[PDB]
Design a protein around this nucleic acid. Structure first.
Ligand SMILES: [K+]
Ligand SMILES: [K+]
Ligand SMILES: [K+]
Ligand SMILES: [K+]
Ligand SMILES: [K+]
Ligand SMILES: [K+]
Ligand SMILES: [K+]
Ligand SMILES: [Mg+2]
Ligand SMILES: [Mg+2]
Ligand SMILES: [Mg+2]
Ligand SMILES: [Mg+2]
Ligand SMILES: [Mg+2]
Ligand SMILES: [Mg+2]
Ligand SMILES: [Mg+2]
Ligand SMILES: [Mg+2]
Ligand SMILES: [Mg+2]
Ligand SMILES: [Mg+2]
Ligand SMILES: [Mg+2]
Ligand SMILES: [Mg+2]
Ligand SMILES: [Mg+2]
Ligand SMILES: [Mg+2]
Ligand SMILES: [Mg+2]
Ligand SMILES: [Mg+2]
Ligand SMILES: [Mg+2]
Ligand SMILES: [Mg+2]
Lengths: 132, 205, 243, 177, 111, 184
RNA sequence: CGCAUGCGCCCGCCGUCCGGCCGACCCGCAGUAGGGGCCGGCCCCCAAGGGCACGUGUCGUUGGCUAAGUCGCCG
RNA sequence: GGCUUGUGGCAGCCAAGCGUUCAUAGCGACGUUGCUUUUUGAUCCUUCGAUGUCGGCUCUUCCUAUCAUUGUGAAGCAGAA
RNA sequence: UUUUUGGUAAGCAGAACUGGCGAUGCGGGAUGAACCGGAAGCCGGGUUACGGUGCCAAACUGCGCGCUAACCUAGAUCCCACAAAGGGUGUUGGUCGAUUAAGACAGCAGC
């Protein structure tokens, strides 16, 4: 039993190319290798499945819907909120945030991590002597 | 293939389910760039085409011998580790000093003998069978091929590997329990660390 | 062009090179397969070729021309005085074959065996195994010896005993330096093999404990030497014409 | 945006003469990689079909034809003539693409693969947009399903860019459909 | 805590000397091919263009009370598509340096 | 031409415990338990509830051919643990009677006097297969078991052990042949 | 594994002096037409793209004290 | 020795006919497609400041287009051959 | 290369037009007087030709579609170092015709 299928309404992540990190909706299927995808901020176009990673989100739309119909369907299902709140979608956001930290911000994060590690190690020691 | 370019004292590669030729070409380039490589579990290397074709190829290799003096080569090594070593030798200018030094930086073993049993082992995606061989196509393990051409240590490696895996499972459970004991520690430390967690929150996965 | 007439080649290519053997004592290249269900028993023995004679016996071979008839057949006499066990060695099965783990020797070693460790026994100080023999004299040393034996019981897969001949008992040989070899122990578990070997330390094992009457055995040794030889005698090629 | 093959309408005629001051005007719909090669193939057919060579002909107009709805999916039928190693043959092919330019690109790629036919050994007789109910090839019919549904059996594992490429990794790829 | 003894600050990245600019049948020692750790594309190479390079090695004799020797160079242009770069040094690097490491400094700085 | 979806389904009886995991099917019934390894098939097995569904996605004609093969094998396992399999063999001879000796708890058979030969032919039944001489019929063997492959393969071993050689097999029809392929 | 040279040799220290490192930190197994974690339903995966580490001082200033914690050395 | 393969040698395709009946168990006329360099020719590229020119004897190794031996299929294979 | 005579044919013999080698290195064709590129004072930089970019070995295991599975040493690049007639219910495309919800085909059943 497979968990994800290519179908009309499936939300997919572009895993390769310039559009990497963007969410698109499969609105029609051309052949085995290509699908017709549409997003609120892009023109409807075809792309190969080799550049797509299917997600668990799936909106309820008809084949090749209008942009207004597509936009409201995504908002109704909270596609953006679900993806960003999910662990998979948060990974992409965190990677961008880490790369965007300046020198001063990295120094602050170092101090927080160093202090966090020191306290955690002390807590573990108590859990060792007591809960041997 | 230009090379990994990483700075490491030593690289330990687990060759399980790696394609022989693609693993050889990548490792040959790493060796030529001055990288020291250790390969373990060479008996689990995979060769495309199936056992029958690979067995026939090795039998043709066994035919080659200096008619007037067979001891003068070619030498037909049967063990999986030596077959991998000879495969890499064909991708290196081993008759030059530069090539000879590159080969001297390579170590190959069947199984995982000490001390490498307690050292992190990496994989090479460009040589992995799961990415390079389409499911349903014929392939054979180098250990299986070596046994049929005169390698008699397959059972010995198999028993030692089972013993190592069981010990690794016990060690894995100890770390698994230790991890469960550490999630409690951070929760207890949560009260003390109020400002610190706020800074790490946007960065935590 | 093809050779005019066909005959088999002279000599065997399976006995090459035809060089002088690198040993004087016959080496056992392979020991009998071990059967754990059988009692511990030695697999080999050393002897000395005394000479040949002939015997007469009445054959019992149904369906043979010799049935109930007498036949004269040559026999060889091999003098086999009992051997003395002086040590035990254990091997571990590894991906690179059998590897020697440890060697444990008996407390007392005869002069004849000690001669095997020297090129000039008389001129030497005869220090062999003197320090080794001392640790049998202390409780801590005895514990160490027993610890080594337990180590063999735990890891060893093949057990062989160190045995030497009592060459002094055959004055005709004119030799005092005894011959030492490893004799594999077959039968029983590894623990039984170690206990079997350690129990015979400094004791004698008669030839009857290894072989018996009417059984087939293999004889290993070095053939008679004959020096530099030509192809006709060495390989059996036919002689060329007189002219 | 960018197509390997472009569709052009090429219009030409024989040079006016005293006998014929208004010679017939011929038009063709030709596929080529650019305008220059479209003109060359136009005179090839006029020379061999209407006996009008470029040396005694006149080029009137050349215009590129663009897909009307490049965002929707259409079924395209292509009637073609090609030369094999032993003669000439006619065949009909169907394709699904957003533009007829893509469908023609698929046709050339397929002919090269399944028949070892080079580009210059193919003549396109006719092209058309076939409605779903009038398609003939099963490779096109099976995607005429309102409830089209299937998994991605084969996936290509790779970093989004070569910046995240490393020779060594601590664990093997984790893949599941 | 480790208790290590060594350089306390690292302001350079390591680069591997791959060889010289060459063809299948000719070699040009005046240019060296260097792989910089962490650089995997031609686009990423643009940041390192003009950066100073140092090939540090040990000689048998002592000069200025040290066995260390340094040959200076810089990154000139990218090589290929996989982040390899072409480098020039005050003197052509010896073939012995193949497989050795060089220090890619962060100066001169354009940022 | 890769079909998007090829699927076939079969009905699981009520008194069968079928367990499927990673193309490893285990069937348990009143007669016993049978297990077969289908990891060599690039198919998708699924239990829906009882029915067994096998699907092939974007598979060539060769790949889809294994869908029915997998179902037939599973059906054989179900019949093996419910009804069993019974293969009957008949001795054929013209002059020399064929003497059979069952031994080892019906797990072995020895054939003597085949075409007058003094050689004794010994065949050992495969796991879970028992051979018994029938009494109702003259010169008949009965092989019983749960796995059809083992029972059928055991009969093949007996048949091929008694091949006539250096003779015209058209006239020298001596041998042991399978006469019925049924179930208990 | 045995025995190992008295004006010699082997070890444990202390100094004298001689010929590539820069955090050179990291042990689950197995599968990939799947594998886990929780209550058939819900979650996790979708590359170490991670985690760990005073990671902060002229290879690192002087003089103290030093709770536990981490780390090195030593029977 | 090299190129060539007419000639020599070996092999295949079509099926008129032979085979009591019956194209193809076994054969293959009329045609037609090849292989081989263990025949002989054709050529004159190497060697004429020299590669010792018949056969046998002796000795090793290699080939298969398999004479015998091992395992099998076919028959106008009852058995034997 | 092309036109072309003798010859079964030849890395054979003899002509026609041009180029080439010989007298000439250099890059490619693994290797080669003639093939492909291209002709050259001694150097630095840039860019290419032919040919290439898994390792040997400078440059992608780059981005796309399909075909092939070789239990014959599957196959792998002008000259070029070979293969034919004839066959395959191997597999992939195409062309013509016939049959089929009024019930075909296979099996089953009594046309
Ligand atoms: K001869
Ligand atoms: K003799
Ligand atoms: K003679
Ligand atoms: K510090
Ligand atoms: K011929
Ligand atoms: K001459
Ligand atoms: K075909
Ligand atoms: Mg390279
Ligand atoms: Mg002969
Ligand atoms: Mg041996
Ligand atoms: Mg003598
Ligand atoms: Mg007969
Ligand atoms: Mg002829
Ligand atoms: Mg004929
Ligand atoms: Mg001469
Ligand atoms: Mg001479
Ligand atoms: Mg000579
Ligand atoms: Mg043959
Ligand atoms: Mg007859
Ligand atoms: Mg001439
Ligand atoms: Mg001249
Ligand atoms: Mg060539
Ligand atoms: Mg230049
Ligand atoms: Mg590729
Ligand atoms: Mg053909």
């Amino acid at each position: 039993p497979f968990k994800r299928f290519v179908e009309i309404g499936r939300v997919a992540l572009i895993n390769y190319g310039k559009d990497y990190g963007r969410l698109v909706v499969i609105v029609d299927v051309i052949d085995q290798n290509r699908a017709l995808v549409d997003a609120p901020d892009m023109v409807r176009s075809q792309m190969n499945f080799k550049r797509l990673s299917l997600t668990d989100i799936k909106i309820d739309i008809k084949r090749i819907p209008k942009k207004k119909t597509l936009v409201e369907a995504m908002e109704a299902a909270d596609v953006k909120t679900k993806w960003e709140n999910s662990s998979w979608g948060r990974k992409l956001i965190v990677q961008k945030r880490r790369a965007a930290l300046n020198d001063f911000d990295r120094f602050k994060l170092m101090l927080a991590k160093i202090k966090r590690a020191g306290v955690v190690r002390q807590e573990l020691a108590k859990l060792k002597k007591i809960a041997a | 293939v230009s090379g990994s370019g990483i700075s490491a004292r030593r690289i330990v590669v687990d060759a399980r389910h790696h394609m022989l030729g693609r693993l050889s070409s990548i490792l040959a380039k790493e060796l030529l760039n001055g990288q020291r490589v250790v390969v373990v579990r060479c008996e689990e290397i995979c060769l495309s085409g199936g056992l029958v074709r690979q067995k026939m190829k090795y039998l043709r290799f066994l035919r080659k011998r200096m008619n007037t003096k067979p001891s003068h080569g070619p030498i037909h090594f049967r063990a999986p580790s030596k077959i991998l070593w000879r495969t890499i030798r064909g991708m290196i200018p081993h008759k030059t000093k530069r090539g000879a030094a590159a080969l001297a930086r390579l170590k190959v073993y069947e199984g995982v003998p000490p001390p490498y049993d307690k050292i992190k082992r990496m994989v090479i995606p460009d040589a992995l069978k799961v990415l390079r061989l389409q499911s349903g196509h014929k392939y054979c393990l180098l250990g299986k091929l070596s046994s049929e051409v005169g390698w008699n240590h397959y059972d010995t490696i198999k028993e030692l590997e089972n013993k190592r895996k069981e010990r690794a499972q016990v060690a894995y459970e100890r770390r698994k329990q230790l991890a469960k004991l550490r999630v409690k520690a951070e929760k207890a430390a949560e009260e003390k660390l109020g400002p610190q967690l706020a800074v790490i929150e946007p960065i935590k996965y | 062009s093809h050779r005019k007439f066909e005959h088999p080649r002279h000599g065997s290519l399976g006995f090459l090179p035809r060089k002088r053997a690198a040993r004087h004592r016959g080496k056992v290249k392979a020991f009998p397969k071990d059967d754990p269900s059988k009692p511990c028993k030695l697999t080999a023995f050393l002897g000395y070729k005394a000479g040949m004679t002939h015997i007469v016996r009445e054959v019992e071979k149904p369906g043979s021309k010799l049935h109930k008839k007498e036949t004269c057949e040559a026999v060889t006499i091999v003098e086999t005085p009992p051997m003395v066990i002086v040590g035990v060695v254990g091997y571990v099965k590894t991906p690179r074959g059998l590897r020697c783990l440890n060697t444990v020797w008996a407390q007392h070693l005869s002069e004849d065996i000690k001669r095997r460790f020297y090129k000039n026994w008389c001129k030497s100080k005869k220090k062999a195994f003197l320090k080794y023999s001392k640790k049998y004299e202390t409780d801590e040393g005895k514990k160490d010896i027993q610890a080594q034996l337990e180590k063999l019981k735990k890891y060893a897969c093949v057990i062989r005993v160190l045995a030497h001949t009592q060459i002094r008992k055959m004055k005709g040989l004119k030799q005092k330096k005894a011959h030492l070899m490893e004799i594999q122990v077959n039968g029983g578990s590894i623990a039984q093999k170690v206990d079997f070997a350690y129990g015979f330390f400094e004791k004698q094992v008669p030839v009857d404990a290894v072989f018996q009457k009417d059984e087939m055995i293999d004889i290993i040794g070095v053939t008679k030497g004959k020096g530099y030889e030509g192809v006709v005698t060495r390989w059996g090629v036919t002689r060329l014409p007189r002219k | 945006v960018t197509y390997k093959f472009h569709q052009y309408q090429v219009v030409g005629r024989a040079l006016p003469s005293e006998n014929d001051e208004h010679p017939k005007i011929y038009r063709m719909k030709l596929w080529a990689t650019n305008e220059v090669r479209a003109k060359s193939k136009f005179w090839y057919f006029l020379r061999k079909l209407k006996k009008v060579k470029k040396s005694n002909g006149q080029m009137l107009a050349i215009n590129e034809i663009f897909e009307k709805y490049p965002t929707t999916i259409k079924n395209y039928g292509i009637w073609l003539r090609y030369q094999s190693r032993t003669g000439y043959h006619n065949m009909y092919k169907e394709y699904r693409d957003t533009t007829l330019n893509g469908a023609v690109e698929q046709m050339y790629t397929e002919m090269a693969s399944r028949h070892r036919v080079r580009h210059h050994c193919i003549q396109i007789i006719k092209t058309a947009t076939i409605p779903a109910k009038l398609c003939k090839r099963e490779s096109t019919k099976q995607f005429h399903d309102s409830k089209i549904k299937f998994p991605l059996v084969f996936k290509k594992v790779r970093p989004p860019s070569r910046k995240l490429k490393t020779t060594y990794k601590a664990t093997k790829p984790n893949l599941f459909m | 805590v480790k208790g290590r003894q060594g350089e306390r600050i690292r302001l350079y990245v390591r680069g591997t000397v791959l060889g010289y600019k060459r063809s299948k049948s000719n070699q040009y020692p005046n240019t060296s091919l260097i792989q910089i750790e962490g650089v995997n594309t031609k686009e990423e190479v643009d940041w390192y263009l003009g950066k100073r390079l140092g090939y540090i090695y040990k000689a048998k004799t002592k000069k200025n009370n040290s066995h260390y020797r340094c040959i200076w160079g810089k990154v000139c242009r990218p090589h290929g598509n996989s982040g390899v770069v072409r480098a020039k040094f005050k003197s052509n690097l010896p073939p012995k340096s193949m497989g050795a490491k060089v220090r890619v400094f962060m100066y001169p700085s354009n940022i | 031409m890769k079909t998007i979806l090829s699927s076939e389904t079969m009905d699981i009886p009520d008194g069968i415990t079928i367990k499927v995991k990673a193309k490893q099917i285990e069937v348990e019934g009143p007669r016993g338990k049978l297990t077969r390894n289908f990891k060599h098939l690039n198919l998708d097995f699924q239990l829906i509830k009882k029915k067994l569904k096998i699907d092939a996605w974007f598979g060539s004609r060769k790949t889809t051919a294994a869908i029915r093969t997998a179902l037939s094998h599973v059906e054989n396992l179900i019949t093996g643990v419910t009804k069993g399999y019974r293969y009957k063999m008949r001795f054929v001879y013209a002059h020399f009677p064929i003497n059979a000796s069952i031994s080892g708890g019906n797990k072995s058979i020895e054939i003597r006097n085949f075409l007058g030969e003094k050689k004794v032919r010994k065949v050992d039944m495969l796991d879970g297969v028992t051979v018994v001489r029938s009494e109702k019929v003259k010169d008949e063997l009965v092989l019983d078991g749960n796995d059809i492959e083992l029972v059928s393969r055991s009969a093949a071993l007996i048949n091929q052990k008694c091949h006539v050689k250096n003779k015209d097999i058209r006239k020298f029809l001596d041998g042991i042949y399978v006469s019925e392929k049924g179930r208990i």
